[PDB]
Amino acid sequence: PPTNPPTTVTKPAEVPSRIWTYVMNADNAYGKGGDFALLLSAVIKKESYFGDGLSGSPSAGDGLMQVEPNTRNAYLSQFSAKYGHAYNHSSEQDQVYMGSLILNEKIVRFGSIYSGLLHYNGGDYWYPGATDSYGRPILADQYANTVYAQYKSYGGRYSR
């Protein structure tokens, strides 16, 4: 365990090491000292169970952070400006980079983690009963509760 520098956030045991790498890469791009890696971990756990929880979902092809096709499409130019290359949906690292960028935008725009997660999952106009592009209902408040809780359990230290 003892790392150089001492600040290196440790992977939660249950997070696969391939995933940890994707999310540290994302964390680094946002200068978050490892804490965003922890939040991203919780989000990927919820969204796709690290890629193992999609079998039989109509949104399976949306990958690790479940960003819907019209959403990925809206963010293309911004993705390329931020990371220096065109978004490649076949890249798991890119899928994480994309979900990261959008989630960071919500957290910055709305001004907190909780409300960032809520709107990440439901969009800016989420209301109870709203439905995703697969016609499933969006439980964005429950999502935010669960994901925030999981982030904290992983040792997340913030609320904004």
Side-chain angles (χ1 to χ4, degrees):
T3 168
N4 177 330
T7 52
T8 309
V9 175
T10 57
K11 186 178 84 42
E14 75 183 358
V15 168
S17 71
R18 95 185 198 288
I19 297 295
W20 192 234
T21 280
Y22 300 157
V23 303
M24 276 301 172
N25 291 332
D27 192 290
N28 290 342
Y30 290 96
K32 293 298 169 165
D35 190 82
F36 193 30
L38 305 171
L39 175 53
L40 290 173
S41 291
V43 168
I44 293 168
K45 190 182 172 180
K46 180 69 158 130
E47 286 292 2
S48 65
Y49 204 81
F50 312 121
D52 308 325
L54 297 179
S55 271
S57 166
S59 74
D62 286 343
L64 282 175
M65 288 186 66
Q66 296 279 103
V67 185
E68 303 196 324
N70 294 337
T71 301
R72 303 185 310 256
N73 181 73
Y75 281 87
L76 289 173
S77 64
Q78 184 166 356
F79 178 104
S80 181
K82 173 73 194 185
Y83 302 106
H85 60 266
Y87 179 61
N88 179 349
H89 196 53
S90 76
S91 160
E92 280 175 5
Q93 176 66 78
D94 286 0
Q95 288 158 37
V96 176
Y97 284 155
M98 174 73 70
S100 277
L101 180 171
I102 298 159
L103 168 66
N104 175 84
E105 178 163 288
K106 301 311 196 187
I107 282 157
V108 163
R109 156 166 346 276
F110 292 102
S112 69
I113 292 173
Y114 189 91
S115 161
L117 292 163
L118 196 147
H119 295 290
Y120 176 73
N121 186 51
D124 297 351
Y125 307 103
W126 183 78
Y127 60 92
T131 208
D132 67 15
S133 82
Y134 305 96
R136 313 172 294 192
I138 309 180
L139 275 7
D141 60 301
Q142 301 178 49
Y143 177 97
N145 289 131
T146 301
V147 178
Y148 185 88
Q150 178 73 72
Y151 163 71
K152 284 264 85 157
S153 167
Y154 283 158
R157 66 141 108 64
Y158 305 115
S159 79
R160 311 180 290 178

